[PDB]
Design a binder for these strands. Structure first.
Ligand SMILES: Cc1nc(N(C)C(=O)Cc2ccc(-c3ccccn3)cc2)sc1S(N)(=O)=O
Ligand SMILES: [Zn+2]
Lengths: 766, 326, 372
DNA sequence: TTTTTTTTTTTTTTTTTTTTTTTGA
């Protein structure tokens, strides 16, 4: 209870600064006019673009990752007007989890959705036009023009789409006597940037510098077309950027269309841009607008903490540190051997290394004999696409397999796409629908804690747990809360159906060894006594579309099971509670990996969450029209009807089985400024969470970690990121000692935090 | 880059602060801080065309009747002067806007066998030449100027310039005794627990390092476990440490490093480096050590370490390969 | 003229039922359940109110026997919503007739739901439909592209009316279990924290207006007034619908007397005592940080050491035990002066003189060995 | 003996509802 105290009393100065930062009116002339964004649309190339200042404010919340910086965000949300966003979908869901654990937070989306990022922008040439900054000292106008030229192929499209959409909106209400506060409510589906000027971007170090200006730019857009009351009040955006500046980095990928060499360079993140740019540190006044959270809560060690301090603050590496980290070094052939460290996540510094490691363990488990099962993943290229693109690349000679030499990464979610063991691509022309299709096999493991990568639609088919676990679900109605408060009737219908379907399970437990004849006699006798105040008999299920029905018909079934669970719980003591209770709406038989959910009826249709830790179960086919929302896309929809698409089944933390949909992703990049839908990749998009790259590890914390370090490529920032993903130093093993080997340390942002920790106007929260 | 006048004023402030520190360190002396001669030399880099550093050397006569003895004693004198010059508001006000790191004095040039570049000499890029900061009440200016040219004024063990009494300051403060460090260490024990020293932990496994060859007593039985580890995880050099004798080399109070030189096969047969596979001769140019330390919940951690003489591995740097429990 | 701020939640969708109540339509109107309420009277003195004056006035307001003490009651019902205000009013009702106040005392001291008749016959149409009149106008303008107007807009486009009344008053009804979840498992929290954080924080102003729900729950946890047993021995977790939470809160003894009167004052007192010590400690922290001029490693050692030495778990526990109360009366409070800052200054911030152009750090470990 | 070439994130609009089983040469 005393843990929150420091945050509780130190976030108040933060709150008492963001308020004046958000309630500061700009001069009339400094407000970006609508005509500005009209001219931006007219401009074709980002060269004649006029030097235009877009005013903004910042407030920086830095601090160790997992330093509980979210308490500050929590206090901000419940006190201030704010639009909470996230740099990654995982981070956005993590903030939602930690904001709805205290009060109500509206669905937290990504900043990309907030400024209008759509599908076609994903693969867009974001680094093309040049800029010779008339700078040193770099004017803010020049920096903003650089960040708009960087994102010309995104800023221009956003401006054009927003502008050419037409005017009503707030313009209408404002003239009530010529009430815009009640305008976003009455006029719905309006962009969330029209109702607040405090934009919280969490884990903002995962965003490049180009985005910062972009966000501000977009803010003004969405407040100019709609003529928001904030625009009439001459308010300016304030970007509360929350993230770890020394545990997070942003990378830019460019693909050269002749060499087929996809390159990824390092970039300046928003945090580093704001901390280390003399122009932004003055305009935004970071000295009076910086909060550093300094405590590592999860950590409960002492020497582990000192090492984190020296690595994060750039302190000199001493002999004692070398001797401490010496106790973690385990051989190269010990980490890579799958027989060792079971259940420990293994980090490598190369995607090829992860592709090697995942394959060897697959062989190990398969030979030793979970189940190493094989599941189809396909691809769909088209003849016209690879005809025209080959024409435009100045090289019309290129084989399709050579097309898939590197664009397989750039055809779907990169993370799992380049970190999966898979077969040989069977690229066969299926031009029936004018197409050429590929076919490989992404072997998984059976019954492992896998994670959903992309956005999937979960369809819960039932619960495979214990009688006690299902009694708990009904008692607290936790399941109902996961579906949201606006549509509770749908959640109550399916639970009702389950209870009327799971009555047979009690009768199987009736056949349990070690029970007296009269013990079972009293069992069935109390079953009869409860039927007297209720045997399945012939209960009439179902209800009309009425709110009262799901609070009367369900109320009976909820009380029926609750009682029934608790009834036999007392009769058989702990044995009944631990007994496995499986409830499904259909005859579900699961021999080996293959499952069979018969014919679905879409009793409860929901959306799987990426953060939710699921468990791989098996690939039932049971073609559901719920996932078959297929409408190019129809040409492959016909083939998906042809070849039965397998729907992989996952088990959530509670234990409810959920059948999910597949994933489809486009590749559109070109060089002739002709973005055309080339290839759509149909696969599963699940990750093992057992092996990954250090760079991706930055995003999410891990329980047990074994780090495989490649010598020569040793960057102390990578070592710090890898070693900081786990709370306890006890469960940490490593290839070599990053402190004892030659390491390229880049301690430039470290001294900047140190000078920030050495400034009277910077607020440090313990 | 800095203007010379600001530098000269900062040097006057440095003279003031250093003389206060000297009159504090040597209490029975008489240092009038307006006549006591301090000598200054700057490295050539008017406009001080300094892009890297302003190389300075400050020479002070040790006031009579004192003589300082010991490397650590002058280390302490340097720390006192350094933390005394960053107290005078004039110095920090003058040079503070220019110094990126406020640390000015290096205290590692006083160990036995460590060299310091003399004034009136260059570096193989800057000939240290005097910069004259006359004492505010110097009664002989020409003498002060023609005092920078006398080697005695800039030599560590110069002849002191009819001695009745002489006071030898041969010891001052210790090392790692900062109040922040001593308070943090004490709070660590209160909140987290006692981490027993290496000697105490080794004493549990019947090792009393007071006598010679006692640590080798445990290193013997430890060799079998280490060899079993290597001939499983690192097999491509297996039959190399079958017969080796632990040779105690380095002894820190939390780090015992015993070399593993062999006799069998050849007396000088070098132990092939376990990592970074090299040629027949390049690989067999490495040394191996065993490191006993205290770790985890006070359990003796044994590490295998190597020192390779090849370019691929850090040359003459100690590396670790596996740490096993004991 | 006693004014009550009341948070309610009907059986189902409270928004639809409330709108139907405003339209005087007998189609959907679940009886109203009131489960948190703040009663206040306009202070007739310019600057007369003191802490004990406020405590006496409040203890008079919340009748110890049960209910309030006024003759006429203007009750402003509210929902969890945002305009940052934590609630939002929906409808206001006058209670001047004997039958009106009899129903209000019954529903305020016990928890029996207020039937649609009692409210519907007492809407202050001069102000009730005035609260949401601008929403009516905005809906008219939007759909184009008082009470008769509300009914007409109800008929014309139902979807947009419901969406507007759910975006505004955003939280509306969340769940019976949500309140028991986010406002502590204890009865003290469930009554007092729900009263303060929702219906008492922003109205009374003060620092507590800017404090979060977890902070307010912590303050309630240290508001450790004596605890009498529950006459029906009903546990706080035995509550399923709002008819149970409302009954728990209304017949509680943290709701109609001294504790209900001392909690708002204790929030202010605790924060004042805490900030007095913390702000002093941060003044020392910031000053020493700004003038340290030490090596990078020793700087980090100081900053972490100081934050520990002032805000360690033991020191914090002693401080929170020094602000815990055993009685709500401010003149009979058992809270005593906190030792946090004085202890922190005595041990660690007493060595600031060592780094004040004294050389006392040397004197601590000087060992001046000059052999003659 | 040179000798490489490492890592990431974003891509929405909703919650139900028409079933088919010999093919080849
Ligand atoms: C031993 C004693 N007990 C005090 N505690 C509880 C602490 O430091 C606790 C802590 C403080 C910071 C971190 C951290 C984590 C990530 C990166 C940097 N830092 C971890 C843990 S302080 C130390 S002391 N007095 O040696 O400085
Ligand atoms: Zn080597």
């Amino acid at each position: 209870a005393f843990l929150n105290f420091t945050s509780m009393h130190g976030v108040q100065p933060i709150l008492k600064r963001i308020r004046e930062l958000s309630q500061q009116q700009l001069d009339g002339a400094q407000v970006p006019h609508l005509q500005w964004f009209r001219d931006v649309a007219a401009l074709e190339s980002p060269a004649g673009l006029p030097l235009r200042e877009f005013p903004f404010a910042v407030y920086l919340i830095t601090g160790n990752a997992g330093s509980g910086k979210s308490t500050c965000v929590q206090t901000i949300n419940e006190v201030l007007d704010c639009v909470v966003t996230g740099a990654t979908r995982i981070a956005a869901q993590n903030m939602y989890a930690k904001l709805s654990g205290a009060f109500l937070s509206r669905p937290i989306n990504t900043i990309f959705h907030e400024f209008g990022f759509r599908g076609n922008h994903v693969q867009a040439q974001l680094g093309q036009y040049p800029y010779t900054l008339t700078s040193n000292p770099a004017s803010l106008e020049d920096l903003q023009r650089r960040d708009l030229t960087y994102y010309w192929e995104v800023i221009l499209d956003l401006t054009k789409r927003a502008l050419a959409a037409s005017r009503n909106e707030f313009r209408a209400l404002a003239a009530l006597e010529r009430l815009t506060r009640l305008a976003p409510a009455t006029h719905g589906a309006l962009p969330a940037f029209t109702r607040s000027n405090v934009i919280v971007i969490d884990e903002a170090g995962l965003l490049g510098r180009h985005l910062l200006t972009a966000v501000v730019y977009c803010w003004w857009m969405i407040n100019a077309l709609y003529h928001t009351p904030q625009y009439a009040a001459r308010l300016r955006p304030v970007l509360v950027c929350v993230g770890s500046p020394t545990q997070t980095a942003s990378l830019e990928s460019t693909f050269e269309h002749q060499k087929l060499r996809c390159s990824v360079r390092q970039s300046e993140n928003v945090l580093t841009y704001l901390i280390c740019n003399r122009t932004l540190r003055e305009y935004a006044r970071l000295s009076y607008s910086w909060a550093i959270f300094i405590n590592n809560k999860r950590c409960v060690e002492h020497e582990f903490g000192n090492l984190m301090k020296v690595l994060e603050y750039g302190l000199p590496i001493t002999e004692e540190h070398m001797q401490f980290v010496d106790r973690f070094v385990v051989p190269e052939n010990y980490i890579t051997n799958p027989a060792n460290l079971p259940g420990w996540t293994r980090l490598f510094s190369s995607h090829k290394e992860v592709s090697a490691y995942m394959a060897k363990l697959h062989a190990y488990l398969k030979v030793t004999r979970f189940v190493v099962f094989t599941l189809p993943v396909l691809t769909f290229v088209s003849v016209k696409e690879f005809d025209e693109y080959r024409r435009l690349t100045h090289q019309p000679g290129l084989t399709i397999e050579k097309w898939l030499t590197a664009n397989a990464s750039r055809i779907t979610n990169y993370s799992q796409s380049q970190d999966q063991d898979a077969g040989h691509m069977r690229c066969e022309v299926h031009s029936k629908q004018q197409l050429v299709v590929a076919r490989n096999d992404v072997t998984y493991v059976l019954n492992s804690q896998i994670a959903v990568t992309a956005r999937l639609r979960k369809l819960v088919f039932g619960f495979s747990g214990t009688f006690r676990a299902f009694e708990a679900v009904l008692r607290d109605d936790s399941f109902v809360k996961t579906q949201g408060e606006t549509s509770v009737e749908f959640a109550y219908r399916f639970l009702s159906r389950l209870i009327f379907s799971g009555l047979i399970s009690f009768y199987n437990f009736l056949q349990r060894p070690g029970l007296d004849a009269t013990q079972r006699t009293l069992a069935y006798a109390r079953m009869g006594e409860l039927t007297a105040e209720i045997f399945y008999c012939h209960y009439t299920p179902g209800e009309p579309e009425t709110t009262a029905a799901v609070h009367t018909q369900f109320a009976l079934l909820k009380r029926a099971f609750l009682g029934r669970f608790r009834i036999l719980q007392e009769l058989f003591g702990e044995a009944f509670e631990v007994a496995p209770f499986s409830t499904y709406v259909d005859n579900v038989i699961f021999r080996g990996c293959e499952m069979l959910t018969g014919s679905p009826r879409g009793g409860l249709m929901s959306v799987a969450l990426q953060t939710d830790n699921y468990t791989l179960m098996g690939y039932t086919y049971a073609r559901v029209f719920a996932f078959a929302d297929e409408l190019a896309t129809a040409n492959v929809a016909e083939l998906l009807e042809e070849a039965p698409l397998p729907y992989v089944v996952l088990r959530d933390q509670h234990g409810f089985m959920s059948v999910v949909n597949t994933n489809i992703s486009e590749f559109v990049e070109s060089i002739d400024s002709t973005e055309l839908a080339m290839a759509i990749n149909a696969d599963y998009g699940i990750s093992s969470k057992l092996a990954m790259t250090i760079t991706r590890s930055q995003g999410l914390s891990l329980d047990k970690v074994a780090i495989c370090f490649t010598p020569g490529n040793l960057r102390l920032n990578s070592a710090y990121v890898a070693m900081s993903r786990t709370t306890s130093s006890e469960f940490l093993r490593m290839n070599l000692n990053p402190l004892r080997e030659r390491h390229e340390r880049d301690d430039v942002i470290s001294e900047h935090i140190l000078s920030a920790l050495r400034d009277p106007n910077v607020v440090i929260v313990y | 880059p800095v203007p010379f006048r600001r530098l000269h004023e900062a040097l006057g402030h440095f003279r003031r602060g250093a003389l206060a520190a000297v009159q504090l360190l040597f209490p029975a002396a008489r240092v009038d801080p307006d006549a006591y001669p301090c000598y200054f030399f700057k490295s050539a880099c008017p406009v001080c065309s300094c892009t890297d550093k302003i190389g300075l050397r400050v020479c002070m006569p040790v006031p009579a009747p004192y003589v300082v003895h010991g490397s650590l004693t002058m280390r302490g004198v340097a720390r006192v002067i350094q933390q005394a010059v960053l107290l005078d508001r004039d110095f920090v006000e003058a040079i503070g806007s220019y110094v990126k790191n406020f640390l000015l004095i290096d205290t590692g040039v006083y160990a036995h066998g460590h060299s310091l570049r003399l004034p009136y000499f260059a570096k193989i890029c800057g000939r240290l030449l005097p910069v004259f900061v006359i004492p505010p009440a110097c009664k002989d200016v020409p003498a002060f100027v023609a005092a920078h040219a006398d080697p005695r004024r800039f030599h560590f063990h110069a002849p002191p310039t009819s001695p009745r009494e002489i006071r030898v300051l041969h010891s001052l403060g210790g090392d790692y005794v900062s109040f922040f460090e001593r308070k943090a260490s004490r709070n660590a024990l209160e909140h987290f627990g006692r981490r027993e020293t290496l000697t105490e932990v080794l004493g549990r496994y019947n090792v009393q390092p007071d006598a010679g060859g006692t640590v080798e007593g445990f290193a013997s039985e430890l060799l079998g476990r280490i060899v079993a580890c290597i001939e499983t995880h690192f097999p491509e050099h297996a039959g190399e440490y079958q017969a080796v004798s632990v040779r105690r080399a380095v002894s820190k109070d939390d780090w015992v490093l015993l070399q593993l030189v062999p006799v069998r096969g050849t007396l000088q047969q070098s132990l092939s480096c376990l990592r970074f596979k090299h040629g027949r001769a390049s690989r067999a140019t490495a040394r191996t050590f065993v490191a006993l330390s205290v770790g985890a919940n006070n359990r003796l951690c044994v590490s295998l370490c190597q020192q390779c003489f090849a370019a691929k591995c850090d040359s003459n740097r100690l590396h670790t390969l596996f740490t096993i429990d004991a | 003229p006693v004014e009550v701020t009341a948070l309610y939640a009907t059986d189902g969708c409270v928004i639809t039922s409330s709108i139907a109540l405003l339209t005087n339509s007998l189609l959907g109107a679940e009886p109203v359940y009131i489960f948190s309420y703040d009663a206040y009277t306009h202070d007739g003195r310019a600057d007369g109110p003191t802490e004990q004056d406020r405590f006496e006035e409040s203890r008079a307001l919340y009748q110890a026997s049960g209910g309030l003490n006024g003759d006429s009651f203007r009750v402003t019902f509210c929902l969890l919503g945002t305009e940052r205000g934590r609630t939002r009013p929906m409808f206001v009702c006058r209670f001047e007739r004997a039958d009106d106040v009899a129903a209000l005392q019954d529903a305020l001291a016990h928890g029996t739901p207020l039937q649609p008749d009692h409210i519907a016959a007492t809407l202050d149409a001069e102000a009730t439909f005035a609260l949401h009149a601008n929403m009516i106008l905005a809906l008219t303008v939007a759909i184009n592209n008082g009470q008769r107007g509300l009914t007409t807009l109800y008929v014309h486009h139902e979807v947009r009316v419901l969406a507007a009344y759910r975006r505004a008053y955003y939280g509306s009804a969340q769940s019976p279990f949500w309140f028991l979840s986010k406002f502590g498992p204890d009865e003290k929290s469930l009554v007092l924290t729900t009263r303060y954080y929702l219906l008492q924080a922003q109205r009374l102003g003060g620092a507590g207006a800017t404090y979060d729900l977890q902070a307010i729950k912590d303050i309630c946890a240290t508001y450790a007034i004596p605890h009498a047993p529950r006459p029906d021995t009903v546990s706080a977790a035995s509550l399923t619908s709002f008819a149970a939470i409302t009954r728990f809160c209304c017949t509680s003894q943290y709701a109609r007397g001294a504790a209900a009167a001392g909690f708002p004052l204790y929030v202010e007192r605790r924060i004042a005592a805490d900030v007095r010590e913390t702000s002093a400690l941060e003044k020392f922290i910031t000053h020493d940080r700004s003038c340290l001029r030490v090596s990078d490693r020793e700087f980090i050692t100081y900053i972490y050491l100081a934050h520990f030495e002032c805000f360690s778990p033991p020191r914090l526990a002693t401080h929170l035990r020094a602000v815990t109360t055993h009685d709500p009366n401010p003149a009979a409070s058992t809270e005593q002066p906190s030792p946090l800052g004085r202890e922190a200054v005595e041990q660690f911030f007493c060595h600031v003189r060592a780094q004040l152009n004294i050389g006392e750090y040397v004197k601590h470990n000087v060992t001046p060995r000059e052999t003659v």
